[PDB]
Design an enzyme around this catalytic site. Sequence first.
Site, PDB file in Angstrom:
ATOM      1  N   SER A 181      46.392  38.688  37.055  1.00 49.40           N
ATOM      2  CA  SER A 181      46.078  39.825  36.192  1.00 49.40           C
ATOM      3  C   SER A 181      44.625  40.248  36.405  1.00 49.40           C
ATOM      4  CB  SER A 181      46.340  39.480  34.728  1.00 49.40           C
ATOM      5  OG  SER A 181      46.139  40.613  33.899  1.00 49.40           O
ATOM      6  N   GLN A 221      41.741  45.658  37.565  1.00 51.94           N
ATOM      7  CA  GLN A 221      42.245  46.968  37.980  1.00 51.94           C
ATOM      8  C   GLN A 221      43.741  47.116  37.676  1.00 51.94           C
ATOM      9  OE1 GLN A 221      40.937  47.672  42.036  1.00 51.94           O
ATOM     10  NE2 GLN A 221      41.825  49.733  42.128  1.00 51.94           N
ATOM     11  N   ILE A 228      47.894  44.685  37.261  1.00 52.82           N
ATOM     12  CA  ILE A 228      48.700  43.453  37.224  1.00 52.82           C
ATOM     13  C   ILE A 228      49.453  43.315  38.551  1.00 52.82           C
ATOM     14  CG2 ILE A 228      50.474  44.608  35.779  1.00 52.82           C
ATOM     15  CD1 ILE A 228      50.965  41.577  34.644  1.00 52.82           C
ATOM     16  N   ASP A 268      29.695  43.371  45.768  1.00 49.42           N
ATOM     17  CA  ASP A 268      30.318  42.729  44.620  1.00 49.42           C
ATOM     18  C   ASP A 268      31.425  41.780  45.023  1.00 49.42           C
ATOM     19  OD1 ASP A 268      30.237  42.217  41.875  1.00 49.42           O
ATOM     20  OD2 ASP A 268      31.605  43.838  41.356  1.00 49.42           O
TER      21      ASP A 268
END
Length: 346
Positions: A28, A31, A33, A145
């Site tokens: 999950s 952005q 699932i 990131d």
Amino acid sequence: DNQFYSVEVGDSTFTVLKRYQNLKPIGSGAQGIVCAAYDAVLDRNVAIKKLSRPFQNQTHAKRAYRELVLMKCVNHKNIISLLNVFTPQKTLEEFQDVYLVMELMDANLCQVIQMELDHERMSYLLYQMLCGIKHLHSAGIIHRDLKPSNIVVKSDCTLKILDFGLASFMMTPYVVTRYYRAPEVILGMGYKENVDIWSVGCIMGEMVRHKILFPGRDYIDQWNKVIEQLGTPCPEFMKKLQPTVRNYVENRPKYAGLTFPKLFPDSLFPADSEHNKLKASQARDLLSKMLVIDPAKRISVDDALQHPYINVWYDPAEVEAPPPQLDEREHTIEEWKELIYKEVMN
Ligand SMILES: O=C(Nc1cnn(-c2csc(C(=O)NC3COC3)c2)c1)Nc1c(F)cccc1Cl
């Protein structure tokens, strides 16, 4: 007769193509699932990701559109590839959700970091992370990131990076992980290729220590952890911070910084043989070259790959690859919906 069918995975309705069978929840993300499913056409297991109304806000839209664009061109074993893209909706007006299909992997790098891995697996995962980053760099994409949760692994130790990095306000309950971000990012200070080397070091150190190196509620608590352990940076580095951020960092208490054997002692590495004694010193040498606050003195991605701990996995077709309207920003809900819809149906 309908091409799609609806199944409830936990509390998330997945409406997928009939070829995708046996959906099971496996993660999950921030952005969307993700499910595991058997693909009837390719005769193989796949991962399905649902983006619920990706056009609902700027942050959601720029990432959904940007990733669909970048995936259409990047081609590498250590970077995610798309097997399929689809929407159950027939028109732009009814268009709501997008589903992305990729090969099903076996585990998140978060799960792998909790294992006491040998030097052979640890060096092979780090090798692939650098090859993936070097290809993104080759394609004009500095990540900024990179974190373990957006990196997945197979039982045969193969690794793939899932996202493409940074482009602010998210009005949701889940907050983003900032622990692997470079000092350049924390302090909002210009970047270049080796900004991702810092994130590789944060992962490598956590692989060894089994605890997040730079925890924190915000960047305030976080910068506290980087200087307490690695020391307050040299005057050369302070002479390139913005004036306001410079007075914050120069006002912080000064620390000499713990040496890398104190931060990562022999106890944390396998040391049952001469081979392992040498590989512990080689891994500690690399950690000390990656976890450097100053990017001008931090190790290159090419030099990281040629380091003794990593260059044992080198191959000509696993380092470089032939490179190839460069993205959009600031659009209404409807303009973003239309741009995303265009990418979904070519
Ligand atoms: O996470 C994503 N993908 C991904 C691929 N494998 N995995 C995974 C993590 S754990 C795990 C597992 O348990 N597999 C068992 C072994 O057979 C079941 C499997 C997660 N996102 C994504 C996506 F899905 C589709 C397109 C783009 C993206 Cl970015």
